[PDB]
């Protein structure tokens, strides 16, 4: 079948849609929850291959 346009982050640009396959992965974004306000940005979390949230925010 044809690639499955997924939404990944470039790490330095802006989360967009890329033509990647299921056997392929990319820097997936993260939705930071703040009380009652959700937000989606690109940010990694010190460790290896995980996403984190900014100070004052949380994981959605």
UniProtKB/TrEMBL annotation:
Keyword Signal attributed: yes
Top-level taxon in the UniProt lineage: Eukaryota
Signal among keywords: yes
Portion of the parent chain present: 23 to 82 of 82
Disulfide bond residue pairs: 3-19, 8-26, 9-42, 32-53, 33-60
Keyword annotations from UniProtKB, A to Z: Signal
Name of the protein: NIP1
Species of origin: Rhynchosporium secalis
